[PDB]
Amino acid sequence: KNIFTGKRLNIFDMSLWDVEFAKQLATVNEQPLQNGFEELIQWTKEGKLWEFPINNEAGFDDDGSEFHEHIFLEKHLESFPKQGPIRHFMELVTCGLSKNPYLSVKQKVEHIEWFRNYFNEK
Amino acid sequence: CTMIRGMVKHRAYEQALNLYTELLNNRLHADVYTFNALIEATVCAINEKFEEKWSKILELLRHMVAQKVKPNLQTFNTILKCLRRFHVFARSPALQVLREMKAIGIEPSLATYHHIIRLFDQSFIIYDIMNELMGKRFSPKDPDDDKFFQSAMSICSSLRDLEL
Amino acid sequence: LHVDVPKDLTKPVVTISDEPDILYKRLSVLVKGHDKAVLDSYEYFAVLAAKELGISIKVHEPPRKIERFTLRVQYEMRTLYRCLELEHLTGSTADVYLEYIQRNLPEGVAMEVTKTQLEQLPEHIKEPIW
Amino acid sequence: VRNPRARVVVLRVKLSSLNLDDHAKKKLIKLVGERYCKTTDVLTIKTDRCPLRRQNYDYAVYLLTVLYHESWNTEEWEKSK
Amino acid sequence: ADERLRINSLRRWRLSRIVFRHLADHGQLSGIQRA
């Protein structure tokens, strides 16, 4: 008969220490690289190599913004003159900013706020 | 608990045990790793025979069930590693440890079989251990798992049996 | 390996999700390189791989360009092109094929892949607003 | 890996597939201007304003949506054709 | 900088020619051959 049948104890039925315990567990299967595919796999797991198929906007999300924040920036013009020549200048400014693909929403908003300030001192 | 674990980690078994008794006197409860530390300390304690050391380990297990702490893989593996130090007298207790480890539902690791094989090698269990392990895929569960195959092959060398 | 072989191999996990996949009418792959032989070998590789992946592929050669400039000492750049138009492939087939051929992209060869996804009208455009 | 040219998205739809009447088709065509090719009956909206590509795709869909709705609308000045 | 741009609103290898030649002439600049 197998060793798996027989008498048993019958006793029971059904921080830093953890970190280093897991790091020591990692060493159990820590072998040297066995070929080139394994090297590429290890590098991409480490974040070394590019992801394929290549995504030209990988790792970039523009702060999760949506298009209507980039195209419709006229809600930042509420505190300005609504019908004078600053309305003209600032509406055209925000039209310019809405066509800028290189800036995020935050920089555009800060720029609009700077004009807010500058006109208010003046 | 942390003092106990570090205390054993640096081989200070006697006052490790004394501080455990102090812990009990303060009506406090110990953690599984602390119990494993304490088992290792009990076995490495000097001037005691096999039987009283085994009784002390059993007493520790009765405490384990007393404070509602459930044993895990590391506890049984430590028990078997300690039992390795007592050669022939420890064989049936090691087998009983393995059977209880299965009955509780804790899957044996590679380190378990490493300890068992090295304990009995001082030998036909390897047939059974292997007939269990054939076809199975394993994961790192014990630091000593990497020592299995080596020890396993040693048996094959000692037994001069090629099919193993 | 003649006797010593791996007993079993852990195939990668490919789970059939529940979402519908993108459909591509066309997938045009414009590879630009400084060497015609490199582009010819890459064309052979890509076309073969498409054949064993079942994807319908056609190849043509867009005209080469030269950029000449002078410092008299006159230097030259040649750019040669190869266009691989794949047709009627799903999102996953396209994705795996592109991963393969981009990981196997040789030196000095840049890639431009245009993907022509197929979509249906938004529900806002099936009828006018009343 | 960043290439600024990857944000561009091009939406192409044949106007015959849009539920348009005569007035709506006329209005749509002479709204879009050169984006519509008479030979092919295809309207092509190229969006590159937004940094990302998902944002430009959403903007293109939004443009087509508003274009359809404003072509199917008859203002007061529309009376004096 | 940005302040300067705002007030305004309110109103190939980057090497020396010779170092280019040595790298270009030695084949160290990819794709740049001599006509």
Which residues of chain E does C65 touch, with a Cβ-Cβ cutoff of 8 Å?
A: none
Q: Where are the alpha helices (DSSP H) in chain B?
A: 2-9, 13-25, 32-44, 50-66, 73-83, 91-103, 110-120, 125-133, 148-159
Size of interface C-D (CB pairs under 8 A): 21
Interface check for C66 against chain D (CB to CB < 8 A): the answer is: no
Name the CA radius of gyration of chain B, rounded: 17
Going A43 to A47 to A50 to A51, the CA torsion angle's sign is positive
Dig out the tokens for D47 from the structure. 């969006």
Phi-psi region of E14 (alpha: psi -120 to 50; beta: other; left: phi over 0): left
How far does the CA of residue A48 sit from the closest CA of chain B (Å)?
A: 25
Rounded to whole angstroms, the Cα distance separating D63 from D16 reads 18
Dig out the tokens for E33 from the structure. 């051959």
Phi-psi region of C54 (alpha: psi -120 to 50; beta: other; left: phi over 0): left
Which residue, chain included where needed, has tokens 């300005």?
A: A80
Rounded to whole angstroms, the Cα distance separating C91 from C88 reads 10
Nearest CA in chain A to D50: A101
Rounded to whole angstroms, the Cα distance separating B110 from B140 reads 9
* Spatial contact of B81 and B115, defined as CB atoms under 8 Å apart: yes
- For residue C56, list its beta bridge partners: C87
For D15-73, strand residue ranges (E) read 36-37, 42-47
Which residues of chain C does D18 touch, with a Cβ-Cβ cutoff of 8 Å?
A: 121, 125
CA-closest candidate to residue B141, choices B119, B108, B164, B118: B108
Rounded to whole angstroms, the Cα distance separating B59 from B57 reads 5
Rounded to whole angstroms, the Cα distance separating B150 from B111 reads 11
Chains touching chain C, criterion 3+ CB pairs below 8 Å: A, D, E
Give the technique used to solve this structure.
cryo-EM
How far does the CA of residue A54 sit from the closest CA of chain E (Å)?
A: 24
Which residue, chain included where needed, has tokens 């009208």?
A: C121
Which residue, chain included where needed, has tokens 């040789």?
A: C106
CA distances from C7 to A28, B33, C4 (A): 21, 37, 9
> What 8-state DSSP symbol labels residue D6?
G
User: Strand D9-14 relative to strand C74-90: parallel, antiparallel, unpaired?
Assistant: unpaired
Phi-psi region of B69 (alpha: psi -120 to 50; beta: other; left: phi over 0): beta
Rounded to whole angstroms, the Cα distance separating B110 from B101 reads 13
Dig out the tokens for B122 from the structure. 């001082």
Rounded to whole angstroms, the Cα distance separating B19 from C126 reads 79
Dig out the tokens for A99 from the structure. 């066509």
Q: Go through B136-147 and write b for each residue having 16 or more CB atoms within 10 A of its CB, e for each that does not.
A: eeeebbbebbbb
* C106 Cβ contact partners less than 8 Å away, ≥ 6 residues apart: C33, C38, C41, C42
CA-closest candidate to residue B115, choices B151, B86, B143: B151
* Spatial contact of B132 and A8, defined as CB atoms under 8 Å apart: no
Q: Which helix (H) or strand (E) holds D12?
A: strand D9-14
Q: Count CB neighbours of C122 within 10 A.
A: 12
Q: Count CB neighbours of B116 within 10 A.
A: 24
Q: Is B50 helix (H, G, I), strand (E, B) or coil?
A: helix
User: Strand D9-14 relative to strand C56-60: parallel, antiparallel, unpaired?
Assistant: unpaired
Q: Where are the alpha helices (DSSP H) in chain A?
A: 16-27, 36-46, 67-71, 85-98, 105-121
Name the CA radius of gyration of chain C, rounded: 21
CA-closest candidate to residue C90, choices C17, C20, C18, C14: C20
Chain centroid to Cα E5, Å, comes to 24
Reported resolution, Å: 2.5
> What 8-state DSSP symbol labels residue B104?
T
Chains touching chain A, criterion 3+ CB pairs below 8 Å: B, C, D, E
Backbone angles phi, psi at C67, to 5 degrees: -110, 115
CA-closest candidate to residue C127, choices D74, B82, D65, B103: D65
Q: Which helix (H) or strand (E) holds C124?
A: none
* Spatial contact of D57 and D47, defined as CB atoms under 8 Å apart: yes
Greatest alpha-carbon pair distance for chain A in Å reads 99
CA-closest candidate to residue C84, choices C101, C103, C59: C59
Nearest CA in chain A to D48: A101
Q: Is A18 helix (H, G, I), strand (E, B) or coil?
A: helix
* Spatial contact of A122 and A80, defined as CB atoms under 8 Å apart: no
Q: Count CB neighbours of B16 within 10 A.
A: 25
